[PDB]
Design a protein around this ligand. Structure first.
Ligand SMILES: [Mg+2]
Length: 495
């Protein structure tokens, strides 16, 4: 029972169910984080163009594959810990719980949390986002304390397809997630942010992820196939329809223009690891723009670079590079005591990412104080954006002001977090970085800003049917703005 439940919990971060992951990570996170571009011309209502149907935007709260599955399996792990007088299984499950649920509040703002039912029923009162985040810290802190007290114990190997029962790795992931969430709240509650960040990296509490061997990843989907691979490939042009040579760029989702403009300008050797080659004459990497009139796949859409992912690829939750860049930002931008210099952490993050992806050339990359992001010259000539996306160069400049340091950190963190679109979206909303290509075909009817982009998802329509009083209370008291995509969540308070 324990092992089945734990692998079911793991599937509540990025779902193994293709169409669920398609909505949460391929159509929501990827485009809103500047990584992926919607690429089916029949998608006339999308998240990325700011006119989504409810069935696209609601998924984090309404899919039975997310909250009901999470809570039903959490209850089964709690049962094991109760029955056995052993708090370690439930501590690990709580880390997974926070990994799953922070994505949900980060999408909507206020959500049901403290009063969610044992089977994941959300027809309950909502918590403010501030209360939800404080609860995440309490939950992680309890789990971290339990695991440190039992740091010599181990789960059976099949009870954990993330870390094979190694409690010391779970401690590092829990502190890393705590650090992620602490930096998330660095503008909205700087006092709490500093305390949580500094605790997370204090060696007395067990450490953070410092090596790629300790990255938080999941591969045992129970379906045989990575769901992002499948979702991005849907509708790929067929070989006998592509002149007799298979198409390799995917179907419904392509690589975004934004990240490719940065990486082309930086001559970045991770490009071949991240992207398929484009079919545009003379151009190895060209992304499709986000927030456009989407072209027909068979004519031009299939020529843009795709996502380079395999059916057997793992799903990422958090990597070591991110932890390094969190510490760089904590030190450089917020003056937190992160255990080292910002320069040291920035360079470590770049080195971790190049190592992770097996890319050569990191030493020249680290020293590059010349090359800049490109503009976006659309080879189709329809959706060009003529300005360079930024002038920020790679090499660390310890003399720079805090705004430039933040930009530089976030750009490299963003590149290293390729495929973690929900995380990129959170960082973009919090910081304004990286500087992206504005939306061109803004279908929001004047509501959403083409530069600031989507700030949240609107609440599910069904909440007004099955949970009216509680969702309306949340809107009136906790949301601090209209229930639409333009209203910022609580932590997005940078001036
Ligand atoms: Mg093709």
């Amino acid at each position: 029972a324990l092992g089945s439940a734990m692998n079911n919990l793991a599937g509540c971060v990025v779902s193994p169910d293709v169409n669920t992951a398609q909505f949460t990570d391929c159509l929501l996170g990827g485009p809103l984080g500047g990584y992926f571009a919607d690429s089916n011309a029949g998608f006339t209502e999308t998240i990325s163009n700011f006119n989504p149907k409810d069935d696209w935007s609601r998924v984090f709260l309404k899919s039975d594959k997310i909250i009901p599955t999470l809570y039903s399996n959490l209850t089964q792990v709690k049962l094991v810990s109760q029955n056995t007088n052993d708090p370690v299984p439930y501590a690990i499950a709580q880390v997974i719980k926070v990994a799953a649920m922070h994505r949900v509040t980060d999408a909507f703002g206020p959500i049901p949390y403290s009063q969610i039912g044992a089977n994941g029923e959300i027809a309950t009162p909502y918590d403010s986002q501030e209360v939800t985040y404080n609860t995440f810290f309490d939950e992680l802190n309890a789990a971290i304390a339990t695991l440190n007290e039992n740091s010599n114990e181990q789960l059976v190997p099949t009870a954990d397809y993330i870390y094979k029962g190694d409690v010391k790795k779970w401690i590092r992931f829990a502190n890393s997630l705590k650090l992620r969430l602490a930096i998330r709240i660095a503008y909205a509650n700087p006092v709490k942010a500093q305390q949580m960040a500094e605790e997370a990296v204090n060696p007395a509490n067990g450490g953070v992820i410092e090596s790629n061997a300790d990255n938080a990843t999941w591969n045992y989907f129970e379906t045989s196939q990575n769901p992002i691979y499948v979702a991005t490939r849907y509708n790929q042009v067929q070989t006998s329809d592509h002149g007799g040579v298979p198409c390799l760029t995917g179907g419904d989702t392509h690589a975004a223009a934004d990240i490719i403009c940065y990486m082309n300008g930086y001559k970045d050797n991770r490009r071949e690891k991240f992207f398929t080659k484009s079919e545009w004459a003379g151009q190895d990497y060209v992304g499709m723009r986000r927030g456009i009139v989407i072209p027909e796949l068979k004519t031009t859409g299939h020529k843009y670079s795709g996502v380079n992912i395999a059916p057997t690829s793992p799903l990422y939750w958090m990597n070591a590079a991110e932890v390094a860049f969190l510490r760089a930002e904590g030190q450089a931008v917020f003056n937190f005591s992160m255990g080292g210099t910002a320069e040291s952490f920035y360079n470590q993050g770049i080195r971790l990412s190049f190592e992770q992806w097996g890319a050569d050339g990191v030493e020249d990359y680290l020293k590059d104080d010349v090359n800049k992001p490109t503009a976006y010259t659309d080879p189709a000539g329809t959706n060009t954006y003529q300005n360079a996306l930024s002038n920020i160069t790679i090499k660390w400049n310890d003399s720079a002001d805090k705004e430039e340091k933040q930009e530089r950190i976030i750009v490299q963190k963003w590149i290293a977090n390729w495929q973690l679109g929900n995380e990129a979206w959170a960082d973009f909303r919090r910081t304004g970085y990286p500087k992206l290509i504005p939306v061109k075909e803004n279908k929001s009817g004047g509501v959403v800003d083409s530069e600031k982009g989507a700030r949240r998802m609107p609440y599910p329509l069904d909440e007004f049917v099955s949970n009216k009083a509680n969702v309306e209370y949340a809107i009136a008291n906790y949301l601090h703005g209209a229930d639409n995509m333009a209203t910022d969540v609580w932590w997005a308070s940078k001036k």
